[PDB]
Structure 1
């Protein structure tokens, strides 16, 4: 019997790919999520993990019997190296456009962020993405019968996006939410409380928390699987239900608590 993934798994530690629900499949690593949403008309790939993960994701797609060339759209959570790292690699393999909200586009073209990213100084360099389609903040990415809805989720980054869609097993259909990271973490310089340095940025983060908390949410998945206890819900160590309609509310509420702790930490330092 396979032993499954640890919550503190390395970002590049391999995971055997497995169904999440219906036509949503997990193709990421033990430490970093990537999802494949499939149809007979082609697929949507969600996230790219770390600049090193291209090959594992591609191997995992094929392990499930899907062809990377049948992926017709790529979307992602946010423009940090640990989720956008293999986008260019995956675009070449699939031929698919990458969809990005406006505040992520320059980062994807450079392969590095700018000072608008809270984690600017700790960024690792990425391959640029060549074919980017600008995604409206409430846009829908459609491939055949598939439709993934964007929920703009700035805060952890300027360009972050949560994604939502329906997956079915026969007539039993579930609202899937791939909620973006909501951690208020930074490099050693950035201060969430310095509004003059980034006007409206923290307010937008608070608004993201409220929007995520309010989503219709049957099955939650997060870019770091442990942030939603994914390995306690699927795979060999699963001991809790996959479906929990309170999950997005609890996720956002915890994130709000942690955001306010970060603000307290900033108040305590000059």
Structure 2
């Protein structure tokens, strides 16, 4: 029997790919999520993990008996190197356009963010993405019978996006939520509380927390799987249920408390 993943697992430590629910499959690493949403008309790939994880994600798609060339759309949580890192490599293997919101596009085109990113100074360089479709803030990415809806989730980054869709096992159909990172982390310089440096940014982070808290949410997954206890719910170490309709609420409420603690830290220093 396999050991499964730790919650402190390296971003590049391999994970056994596997079904999450229905036609939603996990194809990331122990430390970083990536999902494959499948149909007989083509698939949607969710995220690209790190710049080092591209070959793992492709091997994982194949391990499940799907072909990367059948992916017709790639979507992104947020424009940090640990989620966007292998996008260009994945676009080459799949031929699929990458969908992102307007505030993420320059970063995806440069392969590096600008000062609007809380983590600007600690960014790692990644390959520019050649073909990006700018998606509206509640736009829908459609491939055959698949429909993934964007939920704008700025705060951890300007371009952050959560995603929601329905997956079914027979007639038991569940609202999947891939909620973006909500951690109020930064480089050594950035101050969430300095509104004059980025007017409205922190308010929009608060708005994001409220929006994510309100989603219809049967099964939550997050870009860092440990942020939603993923490995306590699927795989060899699972001991809590996969489905928990309170998960988005609790995720957002925990992130609010942590955001407020970040504000207190900034006040003190």
The reply to whether TM is greater than 0.5 is yes
Query: Deviation of residue 213 (structure 1)?
Result: 0.2
Superposed CA deviations along residues 124-144 of structure 1, whole A, max 9, x for unmatched, are 000000000000000000000
Deviation at 1:247, TM superposition (A): 0.1
Deviation track 1:67-88 (CA, whole Å, cap 9, x = no partner) reads 0000000001000000000000
**Equivalent-residue separation in structure 2 for 1:87 and 1:9 (angstroms):** 22
The list of structure 1 runs, each at least 4 consecutive aligned residues, that deviate by more than 3 angstroms after superposition, is none
TM-fit CA distance, 1:174: 0.3
Identify the residue that residue 98 of structure 2 maps to in structure 1.
98
Q: CA deviation at 1:196?
A: 0.2
Residue 239 of structure 1 and its aligned partner are, at CA, apart by 0.2
Identify the residue that residue 198 of structure 1 maps to in structure 2: 198
Partner residue in 1 for 2:128: 128
CA distances 1:91-112 after superposition (whole Å, capped 9, x unpaired): 0000000001000000000000
Distance in 2 between the 1:76 and 1:3 partners?
Answer: 29
Aligned partners of 1:130, 1:152: CA distance in 2, in Å?
Answer: 23
Deviation at 1:31, TM superposition (A): 0.3
Instruction: Return the alpha-carbon distance in structure 2 between the equivalents of residues 14 and 258 of structure 1.
Output: 29
Shift of 1:119: 0.0
> What residue number does 1:154 align with?
154
2:63 aligned with 1:63: yes
Once the two structures are superposed, residues 15-58 of structure 1 have per-residue CA deviations (whole angstroms, 9 ceiling, x without a partner) of 01000000000000000000000000000000000001000000
> In 2, distance between residues paired with 1:188 and 1:137?
30
> Equivalent residue of 2:134, what SS?
strand
* Gapped regions of structure 1 (runs ≥ 5): none
Instruction: Give TM-score scaled by structure 2 length.
Output: 1.00
Deviation at 1:14, TM superposition (A): 0.3
Give the match's secondary structure for 1:55.
Answer: helix
SS in 1 for 2:83: helix
State the SS of the aligned residue for 2:239.
coil
Q: Which residue of 1 is the match for residue 164 of structure 2?
A: 164
Give the equivalent residue in structure 2 for 1:89.
Answer: 89
TM-score by length of 1: 0.99
Q: CA RMSD in A?
A: 0.4
Distance 2:38 2:76 in 1: 16
What is the number of residues matched between the two proteins?
269
* Cα distance in 2 for residues equivalent to 1:263 and 1:113: 23
Partner Cα separation in structure 2 for residue 100 and residue 147 of structure 1:
15
Give the secondary structure class of the aligned counterpart of 2:174: strand
How far did 1:6 drift? Answer: 0.3
> How much has 1:238 moved relative to structure 2?
0.3
Gaps of 5+ in 2: none
